[PDB]
Design a protein around this ligand. Structure first.
Ligand SMILES: C=C(C)CCOP(=O)(O)OP(=O)(O)O
Ligand SMILES: C=C(C)CCOP(=O)(O)OP(=O)(O)O
Ligand SMILES: [Cl-]
Ligand SMILES: [Cl-]
Ligand SMILES: [Mg+2]
Ligand SMILES: [Mg+2]
Ligand SMILES: [Mg+2]
Ligand SMILES: [Mg+2]
Ligand SMILES: [Mg+2]
Ligand SMILES: [Mg+2]
Ligand SMILES: [Mg+2]
Ligand SMILES: [Mg+2]
Lengths: 280, 280
């Protein structure tokens, strides 16, 4: 094969990642916590975040071997956030991607604990499996991951989302504020941890952060568009802006994400193709 | 003052720690997650783990400035484990150290998320606030903390404890297995992260790990002794061994913890005094 095909590029990275994730949890005593963690971690899905991490690392002159442990850690973090999000105390989903939810399968106590275990393991895994990284770079990755997950990132976003339920004062700005924390921080971490591992400059990181923020929002706008075209109220992009402006804003976010990476040269084409996919 | 007094030694370290913890969480948007985290982190208590970390770091030729960020991270981890332990899905305690429990005060959703935030912040805080550490040492601390919290440590211990409820086959060995994960891993991490920061040898670390494991078990034996002298059934040390053997085993654990540190010379006296306290 001589030409770039996104579907096949992703297929190959998804396989490498799902093999690494499988490897990463050898069942030990107590077997149940490993069964519960494996249930959610190996449940499949797009594996976008690890793939973004590997992709951004390669973009910046790193390789898959350097990025794969961080890539896994990002998926462990993503999975923990899903396990916790599904809980009766939160969304109370009985199903996820056509499969029953962790707490329905093992109980709420085990689900809460499998989430905690995956978050812990993320940090252990990055350090124990990346001895070839520059130590100052790995520590910057650890700092970034801790910042991404907590009050200033993902957990901050979950609280901002809870605070939005049954309110009549949500604006496009406050909805964007929710999404930039809830999902944007982890997408940004996914491309910036890859770049940081490869030794990327502050200037290169700022472009990747713009890309990541814009693809994150674009995903959430398109999602809202698909919802409205297909529990207290919650305002969405189309409910606040109308469908015409929602659609133009999604296109414009994807355009700015693609332009943001143009100065990396053709090495950026895979990340640009991921952005285009969101609006195809 | 010319002589060592444990009560005053602890008072001084507890003050430095509670000031650092207070400092570590400046309220920002969304204020609620910072209020919820601060509620549990600043609720007081013995601050044993941070104090052990600072103490073991000083024992090994480090200082309080080197250890304080890790010391805080250990208390953040401890607090997260308490917030999660108290949840309706777990122990369902409405109170803790005479104060209402995080989920009663903010809700289960916020409590779950404040726990996640504190666990995340632990890792961020260690890296961002310890630039003077040797980078390979800090990464070993991060690895140790991730390993301590997860399936092989604290979360493993919580699952082993859940698995013990209403069983008739618990032995002193299986009760010890629960406690070495549930509390022993984090006490061990508390003295080993301090020692690792100060550049301690593998040989010195092994003595500190023996000390930490023995003071951890001694605490749990004495606790069971005090319970039985003062929900499905749960076997305890006195219910399995009798009170005479329980008491001899607590004394013997404390003796082995003190002997384990004798080869450090008099620098070990503070850690030895902490051990003696457990049985006084
Ligand atoms: C923080 C994250 C990404 C957890 C899932 O958030 P959502 O609430 O958007 O997910 P669904 O329940 O809609 O699947
Ligand atoms: C893992 C830890 C240390 C959480 C508290 O455990 P416990 O179940 O022993 O604590 P209490 O509810 O008895 O306070
Ligand atoms: Cl460039
Ligand atoms: Cl020595
Ligand atoms: Mg949800
Ligand atoms: Mg959900
Ligand atoms: Mg939406
Ligand atoms: Mg181009
Ligand atoms: Mg308990
Ligand atoms: Mg409890
Ligand atoms: Mg007990
Ligand atoms: Mg002595």
């Amino acid at each position: 094969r001589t030409d770039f095909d996104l579907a096949q590029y992703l297929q190959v990275k998804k396989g490498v990642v799902e093999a690494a994730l499988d490897s990463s949890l050898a069942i030990a005593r107590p077997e149940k916590i490993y069964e519960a963690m494996r249930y959610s971690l190996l449940a499949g899905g797009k594996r976008l975040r690890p793939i973004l991490c590997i992709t951004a690392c390669e973009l910046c002159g790193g390789d898959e071997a350097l990025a794969l442990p961080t890539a896994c850690a990002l998926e462990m973090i993503h999975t923990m956030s899903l396990i916790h999000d599904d809980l009766p105390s939160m969304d109370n989903d009985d199903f996820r991607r056509g499969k029953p939810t962790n707490h329905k399968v093992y109980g709420e106590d085990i689900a809460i604990l499998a989430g905690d275990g995956l978050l812990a393991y993320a940090f252990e895994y990055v350090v124990t499996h990346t001895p070839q990284a520059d130590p100052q770079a790995l520590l910057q990755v650890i700092a970034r991951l801790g910042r991404t997950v907590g009050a200033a990132g993902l957990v901050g976003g979950q609280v901002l989302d809870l605070e939005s339920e049954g309110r009549t004062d949500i604006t496009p700005e406050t909805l964007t504020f929710i999404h930039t924390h809830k999902t944007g921080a982890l997408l940004e971490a996914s491309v910036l941890t890859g770049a940081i591992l490869a030794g990327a400059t502050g200037e290169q990181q700022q472009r990747l952060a713009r890309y990541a923020q814009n693809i994150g929002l674009a995903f959430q706008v398109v999602d809202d568009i698909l919802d409205i075209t297909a529990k207290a109220q919650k305002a969405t992009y189309p409910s606040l802006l109308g469908l015409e402006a929602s659609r133009a804003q999604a296109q414009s976010l994807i355009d700015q994400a693609i332009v943001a990476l143009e100065p990396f040269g053709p090495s950026a084409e895979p990340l640009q193709a991921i952005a285009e996919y969101i609006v195809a």
